[PDB]
Amino acid sequence: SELLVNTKSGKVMGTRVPVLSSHISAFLGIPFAEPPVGNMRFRRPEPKKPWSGVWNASTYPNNCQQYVDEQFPGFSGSEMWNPNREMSEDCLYLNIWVPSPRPKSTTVMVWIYGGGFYSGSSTLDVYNGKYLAYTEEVVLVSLSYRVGAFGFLALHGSQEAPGNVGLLDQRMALQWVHDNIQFFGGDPKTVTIFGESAGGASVGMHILSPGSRDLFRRAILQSGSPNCPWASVSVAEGRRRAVELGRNLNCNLNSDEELIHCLREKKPQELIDVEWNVLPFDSIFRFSFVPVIDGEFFPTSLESMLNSGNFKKTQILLGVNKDEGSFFLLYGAPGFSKDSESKISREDFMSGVKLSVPHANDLGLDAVTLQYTDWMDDNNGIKNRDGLDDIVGDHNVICPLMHFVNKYTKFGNGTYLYFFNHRASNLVWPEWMGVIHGYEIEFVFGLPLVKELNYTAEEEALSRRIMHYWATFAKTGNPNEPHSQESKWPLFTTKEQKFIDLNTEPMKVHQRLRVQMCVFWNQFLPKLLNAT
Ligand X SMILES: *[C@@H]1O[C@H](CO)[C@@H](O)[C@H](O)[C@H]1NC(C)=O
Q: Give the interface segment with ligand X, choosing from 33-41, 53-61, 90-98, 164-172 (CB under 6 A).
A: 53-61
195 and 167 Cβ atoms separated by less than 8 Å: no
Check: CB of residue 143 under 8 Å from CB of residue 203.
no
Residues 61-80 that bind ligand CCD (CB under 6 A): 69
Residue 324 annotated in active site? yes
Using CA atoms, how far apart are residues 442 and 439, in angstroms rounded to an integer? Answer: 6
Q: Does 116 bind ligand CCD (CB under 6 A)?
A: yes
Q: Is 393 in contact with 419 (CB distance < 8 Å)?
A: no
The option from ligand CCD, a copy of itself, Cl ion, none interacting with 376 (CB < 5 to 8 A, set by class) reads a copy of itself
CB 128 within 8 A of CB 176: no
Quote the CA–CA distance of 88 and 86 in Å, as a whole number: 7
Please choose which of Cl ion, ligand CCD, ligand X, none residue 413 contacts, taking the beta carbon within 5 to 8 angstroms, the exact cut-off set by kind.
Answer: ligand X
Q: Is 370 one of the binding residues for a copy of itself (CB under 8 A)?
A: yes
Encoded one letter per residue, x for contact with ligand X by CB under 6 A and - for no contact, window 414-443 reads x-----------------------------
Measure the CA–CA gap between 513 and 75, rounded to whole angstroms.
Answer: 34
**According to the binding rule CB under 8 A, does residue 363 interact with a copy of itself?**
yes
**Identified catalytic residue from 437, 440, 442, 459:** 437
32 binds ligand CCD (CB under 6 A): no
For ligand CCD, the nearest residue by Cβ is 197
Q: How many whole angstroms separate alpha carbon 410 and alpha carbon 497? A: 12
Angle subtended at Cα 101 by Cα 469 and Cα 11, rounded to the nearest 5 degrees: 105
**Which partner, Cl ion, ligand CCD, ligand X, none, binds residue 518 by CB below 5 to 8 Å per kind?**
Cl ion
Q: Are 503 and 421 in contact (CB under 8 A)?
A: yes
Among residues 413 and 511, whose Cβ is nearest to a copy of itself?
511
Q: Please, which residue, 134 or 418, has the CB nearer to ligand CCD?
A: 418
Q: In what order do the strands lie in the sheet with 10-13?
A: 4-7, 10-13, 54-56
Residue type, 372: Y
Considering only residues 511 through 530, tell me which ones interact with a copy of itself, judged by CB under 8 A: 511-512, 515-516, 519-520, 523-524, 527-528
Q: How far is the CB of 8 from ligand CCD (least distance, A)?
A: 31
What's the rounded Cα separation, in Å, for the pair 209 and 197?
18
355/368 with CB nearer ligand CCD: 355
Please give the distance of CA 314 from its chain centroid, rounded to a whole number.
20
- 3-state secondary structure at position 319: strand
Considering only 71, 252, 361, 413, the residue that binds ligand X (CB under 6 A) is: 413
- Per this entry, what is the length of the chain? 532
Nearest CA among 123, 108, 97 for reference residue 20: 97
DSSP β-ladder status, 316-321 and 186-196? unpaired
Decide if residue 198 touches ligand CCD (CB under 6 A).
yes
Task: Identify what 493 binds: a copy of itself, Cl ion, ligand CCD, none; CB under 5 to 8 Å per kind.
Answer: Cl ion
From the list 119, 13, 9, 14, the residue with the least C-alpha distance to 67 is 119
Per CB under 8 A, 532 contacts a copy of itself: yes
- Which residue is catalytic, options 324, 440, 442, 460? 324
* Shortest Cβ 414–ligand X spacing (Å): 4
Among 58, 248, 283, 373, binds ligand X (CB under 6 A): 58
Helices (H) and strands (E) in the chain, counts: 18, 14
494 binds ligand X (CB under 6 A): no
Candidates 52-60, 155-163, 233-241, 340-348; binding stretch for ligand X (CB under 6 A) = 52-60
Strands annotated E in 373-513: 415-420, 498-502, 509-511
Considering only residues 21, 53, 74, 375, which one is a binding residue for a copy of itself as defined by CB under 8 A?
375
Q: How far is the CB of 517 from a copy of itself (least distance, A)?
A: 9
What is the Cα–Cα distance from 459 to 266, expressed in whole angstroms?
A: 47
Q: How far is 470 from 136, CA to CA, in rounded Å?
A: 9
297 lies in the site for a copy of itself, by CB under 8 A: no
Instruction: Name the strand (E) or helix (H) holding 205.
Output: helix 198-208
Beta-carbon contacts of 452 under 8 Å, excluding residues fewer than 6 positions away, are none
Tell me the closest approach of the beta carbon of residue 244 to ligand CCD, in angstroms. 15
Q: Which does 59 bind (CB under 5 to 8 A by kind): ligand CCD, Cl ion, ligand X, none?
A: ligand X
Name the residues that contact a copy of itself, by CB under 8 A: 363, 366-367, 370, 374-376, 511-512, 515-516, 519-520, 523-524, 527-528, 531-532
Q: Known catalytic residues?
A: 197, 324, 437
| Interface contacts to ligand CCD, rule CB under 6 A | 69, 81, 114-116, 197-198, 276, 328, 331, 437-438
Judged by the rule CB under 6 A, the positions of this chain that interact with ligand X are 56, 58-59, 413-414
